[PDB]
């Protein structure tokens, strides 16, 4: 029985015998659906994950230069020229610098100067496109009340896993003796990934806006090619210093890693699992089809033996109460007697159960079960079992305006 | 007018709503023989024996198939009964019954074809319920799912009343008054 620990929990209510209920699944959040005359089920989005994305553009945030060369020329001796001037791997700069007798020239004035450097790219970051063919949401479904915090569901009938894509938003999940649930999840309202790039920088991953990505002041290449690619705007990491008569020192700026890290302070963070990316930003409007769902023991007899406590009843973050009971009887499967009475003489049911129609499934003695109850405000009594050996436990619920 | 059948001998009764109890599960590891439960050979119990994958990851020394078996005590909650009508205890009145049975289900009655009745997929017995009857073919309502190390989740089908009813659509509607039955 999940969600009880979860802070951002919802309680979607049913109808009389309806067919559809709308929910919104947020990452880390959880939705407890309680339809009338249906088992209570827990729906939660557990993994948004992207893969096989097409690279769009890579920026360089750490470059190096080697084997630079300059060429000088006196006034009236034409423009300066190197052969490495046309090479794309080489970044260059033209400038005019004062010349005279004091440095080889026949007359005082301006001489031509050119300087080139070989552009290497030590490290780069890559932005990838997020097509619908890359998304794959995974939703977990768990009927309230089973045998016993983690995931080991493949065997459990109360628990089922489903996967959803933008090009396959529909899925069905069988829940054993509880029937089956339906899911039609709109991926458009999921998140506007048509305005987002997936940024990868040295094992660190983010989701960035496309326009912010396009406005990054770094050298860059498009898509990608083996060996050595052609870098545009190399001048973002390579500056020229103060020009002399026959030379001009060229220097590469330091690493721009921390700069970008800071530029990404509020950006969405992505986890990395090999060639797969794993988001934690979740939003999914889903339509739950419920008519194929069913209660297990509508016609069970009640549990006549004694229930006992195993944990002392605790209050959740939402005011509800979780209890864990041990049933010694062997007349299982049977129906669990569980209500809340404000008056022990009449046993008139007040409040409501969250775990709708609790049922012991095993006929072996000393079984365990977790019940969740939604008590009234103030004092009341949690009542479990029947007759003499019934558990009556005083409870109190606090107030409003959080 | 008063077309009336007299006392009838019950042919065969089909259960359409069923329940389980005393459900138990035994599982042995590899090189340690097949699994055994007490009520495995019991006739009131529906059972399932299969082989599940065992290893270190689920509490066993050596890798390989281990023998699992699960047994649940089958019991009937709602059944329909069939009756044979011979042109012997029948009585015409005014102011082919070798092909028909008198089907009765939850206070509603029909006259149905022999073959159709004899070939419906539900648990059944023959004779009459003096209590403790043997239910044949209980697997029609109780199935075993998810072969697993320590257990095997059983599932009981819900009432097949609606399906049986919708099957009897183009069927001869009848009626009864006490220990007899009014025809038409």
């Amino acid at each position: 029985i999940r969600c009880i620990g979860v802070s951002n929990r919802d309680f979607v209510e049913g109808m009389s015998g309806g067919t559809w209920v709308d929910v919104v699944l947020e990452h880390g959040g959880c939705v407890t659906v309680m339809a009338q005359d249906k088992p209570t089920v827990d729906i939660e989005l557990v993994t948004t994950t992207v893969s096989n994305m097409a690279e769009v553009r890579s920026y360089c945030y750490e470059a190096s230069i080697s084997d630079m060369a300059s060429d000088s020329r006196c006034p009236t001796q034409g423009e300066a020229y190197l052969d490495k001037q046309s090479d794309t791997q080489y970044v260059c700069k033209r400038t005019l610098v004062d010349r005279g007798w004091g440095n080889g020239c026949g007359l005082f004035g301006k001489g031509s100067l050119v300087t080139c450097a070989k552009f290497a790219c030590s490290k780069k970051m890559t932005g990838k496109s997020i097509q619908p063919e890359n998304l794959e949401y995974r939703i977990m479904l768990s009927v309230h009340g089973s045998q016993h915090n983690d995931t080991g569901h493949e065997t459990d009938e109360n628990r089922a896993k489903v996967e959803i894509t933008p090009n396959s938003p529909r899925a069905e999940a069988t829940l054993g003796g509880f029937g089956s649930l339906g899911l039609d999840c709109e991926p458009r309202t999921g998140l506007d990934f048509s305005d987002l790039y997936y940024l990868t920088m040295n094992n660190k991953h983010w989701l960035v806006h496309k326009e912010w990505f396009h406005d990054i002041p770094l050298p860059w290449h498009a898509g990608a090619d083996t060996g050595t690619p052609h870098w545009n705007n190399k001048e973002a990491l390579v500056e020229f210093k103060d020009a002399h008569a026959k030379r001009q020192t060229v220097v590469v700026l330091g690493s721009q890693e921390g700069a970008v890290h800071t530029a990404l302070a509020g950006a969405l963070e992505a986890e990395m699992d090999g060639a797969k990316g794993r988001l934690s930003s979740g939003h999914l409007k889903c339509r739950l089809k419920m008519d194929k769902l069913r209660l297990k023991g509508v016609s069970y007899s009640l549990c006549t033996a004694a229930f006992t406590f195993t944990k002392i009843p605790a209050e959740t973050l939402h005011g509800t109460v979780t209890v864990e009971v041990q049933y010694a009887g062997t007349d299982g499967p049977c129906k669990v007697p569980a209500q809340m009475a404000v008056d022990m003489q009449t046993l008139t049911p007040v409040g409501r159960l969250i775990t709708a129609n609790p049922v012991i499934t095993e006929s072996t003695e000393n079984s365990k079960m977790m019940l969740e109850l939604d008590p009234p405000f103030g004092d009341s009594y949690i009542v479990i079992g029947v007759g003499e050996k019934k558990i009556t436990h005083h409870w109190h619920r606090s107030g409003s305006t959080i | 007018v008063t077309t009336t059948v007299s006392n009838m001998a019950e042919v065969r009764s089909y259960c359409y709503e069923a329940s389980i109890s005393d459900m138990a599960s035994d599982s042995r590891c590899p090189t340690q023989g097949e699994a055994y439960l007490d009520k495995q050979s019991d006739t009131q119990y529906v059972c399932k024996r299969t082989l599940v994958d065992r290893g270190w990851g689920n509490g066993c020394g050596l890798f390989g198939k281990g023998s699992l078996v699960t047994c649940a005590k089958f019991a009937c909650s709602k059944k329909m009964t069939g009756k044979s009508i011979q042109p012997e205890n029948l009585e015409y009145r005014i102011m082919d019954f070798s092909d028909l049975y008198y089907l009765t289900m939850n206070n509603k009655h029909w006259l149905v074809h022999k073959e159709w009745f004899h070939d419906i997929p539900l648990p059944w017995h023959a004779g009459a319920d003096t209590g403790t009857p043997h239910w044949n073919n209980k697997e029609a309502l109780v199935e075993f799912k998810d072969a697993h190390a320590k257990r095997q989740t059983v599932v009981v089908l819900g009432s097949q009343e609606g399906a049986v009813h919708t099957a009897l659509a183009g069927a001869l509607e009848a009626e009864m008054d006490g220990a007899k039955g009014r025809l038409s």
Epitope: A275, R278 | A149
Partner: antibody, heavy 127, light 111 residues
Framework: EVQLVESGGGVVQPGRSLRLSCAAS????????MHWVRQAPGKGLEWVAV????????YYADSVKGRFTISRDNSKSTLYLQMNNLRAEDTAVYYC????????????????????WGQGTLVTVSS | QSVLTQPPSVSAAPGQKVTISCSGS????????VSWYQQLPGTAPKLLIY???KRPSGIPDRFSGSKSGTSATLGITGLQTGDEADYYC???????????FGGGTKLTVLG
């Protein structure tokens, strides 16, 4: 340009030990999980072991438990398998293999598949 | 006799169509992702299918993958003699906490 190269296998004797190595070149080796998968002569593939992206998670076949020890050096992009107390039925061509995931999650294992494969190394336990 | 069971062998004429199955449990094939691996004679295994029905680049559209219940199928159509090989299904097993391969299936293209 992904490539994996196994090495360190030969004609070893039983009871003793051996240490296989795999050289990776074409990826961020310290970002993907790594597999050891062996194949007896003219037999089927038998998955031996797996280690995660950082080396905090290791899984072994029930046949090679308490005898084999998988490890890795991210610093030089190498995969090590440490087999001690060998047997006859450990005789096989040993392949190392790139996963697709690094196994950085709970959901990693159920999605895992062996992406790129090496070329193998014959390990004979002759006695 | 195997955790994932696939038939020992299968055969078909050139130009025909053949499918290879492997069956498991809810703890492996049922919930996890099935992948297929082709092993040509005297050659390292090669990834054929991933995520139960996806093809790596370079793998022709003749190859297809499907998954239903606790069994998965690989489909090879427009069969060629070059397809003659040993085919393996594989997936992670959650109960045994162990990655598992199928027994293998020798595909022969009758000549």
């Amino acid at each position: 340009e992904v490539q994996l190269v196994e090495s360190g296998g030969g004609v070893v004797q039983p009871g003793r030990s051996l240490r296989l190595s795999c050289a990776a070149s074409g990826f961020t080796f310290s970002s993907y999980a790594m597999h050891w998968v062996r194949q007896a002569p003219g037999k089927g593939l038998e998955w031996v072991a797996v280690i995660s992206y950082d080396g905090s998670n290791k899984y072994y076949a029930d046949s090679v438990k308490g005898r084999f020890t998988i490890s890795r050096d991210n610093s030089k992009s190498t995969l090590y398998l440490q087999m001690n107390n060998l047997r006859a039925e450990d005789t096989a061509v040993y392949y190392c293999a790139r996963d697709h995931l690094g196994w950085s999650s709970i959901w990693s294992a159920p999605e895992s598949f062996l992406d790129y494969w090496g070329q193998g190394t014959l390990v004979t336990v002759s006695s | 006799q195997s955790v994932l069971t696939q038939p020992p062998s299968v055969s078909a004429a050139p130009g025909q169509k053949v499918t290879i199955s492997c069956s498991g449990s809810s703890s492996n094939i049922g919930n996890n992702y099935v992948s297929w691996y082709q092993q040509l004679p005297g050659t390292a295994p090669k990834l054929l299918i991933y995520d139960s029905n996806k093809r790596p680049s370079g793998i022709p559209d003749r190859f297809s993958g499907s998954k239903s219940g606790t069994s998965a199928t690989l489909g090879i159509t427009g069969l060629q003699t070059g397809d003659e090989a040993d085919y393996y299904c594989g997936t992670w097993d959650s109960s045994l906490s162990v990655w598992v391969f199928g027994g293998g299936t020798k595909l022969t293209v009758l000549g």
